[PDB]
Ligand SMILES: NC(=O)c1cccc2nc(-c3ccc(C(=O)NCCc4nc5ccccc5[nH]4)cc3)[nH]c12
């Protein structure tokens with residue numbers, strides 16, 4: 001295989017020779033240099049947005065991959081210039097990633113219940129790396145996890161303090177923001193190619209009557225998501 005060794009390692013991690021498995025993902029995968037500005041920004045995002053109540057583990061970045069899923073950017077076009085585009089976290093079990101990279105993030109079918117979907121059947125993201133990392137269900141035995149950075153086209157946000165359990169938004173609303181008590185310091189936000197990166201260290205939001213500790217972002221159209229990076233993380237438990 002002519003692929004870089006980090007990419008070979010990733011392929012083995014989420015699965016028949018290696019190259020056919022790579023072509024099975026239908027995804028261009030490049031290694032972001034560890035000494036690049038991209039990598040510095042992403043490591044800062046990981047460092048600053050770890051919650052205090054997720055003190056069960058520390059996160060260390062092993063490898064950062066730049067991913068382009070076949071056809072995804074072509075279908076994100078309708079939302080490419082939509083205001084309020086943010087770079088957000090999405091965690092998931094390693095076992096799922098083979099699907100995620102080949103089919104993209106997807107929404108539960110209409111026949112599925114709304115139980116367990118705090119803000120309806122959609123695609124969920126976080127601005128706190130620990131909140132997304134919790135959804136990797138990493139164990140002390142296998143302390144390596146995968147997590148996505150995705151450009152989400154949030155547009156006009158429906159800001160909610162309590163759960164709705166429905167996936168239908170009012171007219172002129174493109175996403176839902178679950179308001180948490182703690183948000184990244186907005187004066188530290190930066191723009192990485194027209195896309196906001198809320199990598200500020202956590203502070204209080206002032207939102208009082210909220211059921212969430214940290215923010216959530218939900219979109220209800222797969223075309224509103226554009227995966228940009230895939231991180232491999234060492235979980236260091238206490
Ligand atoms: N992955 C992230 O980075 C991420 C980030 C921020 C908020 C997030 N919410 C989810 C989430 C939601 C819903 C589901 C989901 O299949 N429920 C349906 C199944 C179900 N029945 C339940 C009944 C009770 C309690 C929990 C339940 N989950 C999974 C993940 N993932 C989030």
Ligand SMILES: OC[C@H]1O[C@@](CO)(O[C@H]2O[C@H](CO)[C@@H](O)[C@H](O)[C@H]2O)[C@@H](O)[C@@H]1O
Nearest residue numbers: 167168169170171172173174175220221
């Ligand atoms: O009521 C939705 C509101 O937003 C728009 C933006 O074009 O549609 C977005 O929101 C819906 C989410 O439920 C989806 O129908 C659609 O895919 C999504 O882009 C408008 O259609 C509408 O005014």
